[PDB]
Amino acid sequence: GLSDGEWQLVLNVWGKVEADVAGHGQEVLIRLFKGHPETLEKFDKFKHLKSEDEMKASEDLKKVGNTHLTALGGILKKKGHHEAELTPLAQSHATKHKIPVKYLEFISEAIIQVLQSKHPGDFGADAQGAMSKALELFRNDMAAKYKELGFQG
Numbered sequence: 820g821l822s823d824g825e826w827q828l829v830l831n832v833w834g835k836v837e838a839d840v841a842g843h844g845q846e847v848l849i850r851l852f853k854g855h856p857e858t859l860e861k862f863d864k865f866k867h868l869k870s871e872d873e874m875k876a877s878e879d880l881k882k883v884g885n886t887h888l889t890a891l892g893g894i895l896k897k898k899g900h901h902e903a904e905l906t907p908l909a910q911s912h913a914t915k916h917k918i919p920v921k922y923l924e925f926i927s928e929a930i931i932q933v934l935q936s937k938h939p940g941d942f943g944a945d946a947q948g949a950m951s952k953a954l955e956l957f958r959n960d961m962a963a964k965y966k967e968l969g970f971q972g
């Protein structure tokens with residue numbers, strides 16, 4: 820539960836991401852992998868990338884980052900009513916990609932780190948608090964979906 824005002828700050832900063840999704844998606848995956856390298860292992864496509872420069876050159880990394888932020892923007896615009904976009908996500912990440920719920924926490928933080936690095940004037944104390952509650956709400960619903968499918972990592 821976010822107030823309408825909070826959803827509004829969230830969608831306003833999200834507008835910055837939509838003017839460049841692939842660029843923000845790439846920076847988010849490089850941050851996640853620089854901050855939690857163990858997350859790099861779930862991506863078979865990227866197991867062989869050895870440096871930030873190889874990651875920056877990868878066009879597959881850019882497309883996967885693009886896909887991740889385009890699927891996240893779609894869930895945020897639902898403003899809490901994303902049960903339906905959430906289910907297939909929870910089914911594939913739980914059962915096929917095998918993403919433990921703590922990694923959802925690692926990507927939430929890389930997202931906030933890239934918004935803070937890229938848009939400091941627009942990502943003030945309030946947009947920051949609205950944005951972390953929104954990613955937290957999303958994390959929590961996903962874990963709830965993970966525990967009903969019989970998983971939870």
Ligand code: HEM
Nearest residue numbers: 858861862864883886887890891908911916918922923926
């Ligand atoms: C921000 C939360 C996330 C969103 C919205 C998201 C969304 C997606 C989407 C839409 C896809 C493509 C279709 C599908 O397989 O379901 C995908 C693929 C994938 N996701 Fe995520 N995901 C998220 C978090 C994560 C995390 C934290 C990891 C690993 C640490 C991850 C690993 C993967 C992998 C390995 C794939 C397959 C990529 C490929 O084609 O190689 N996802 N994700």
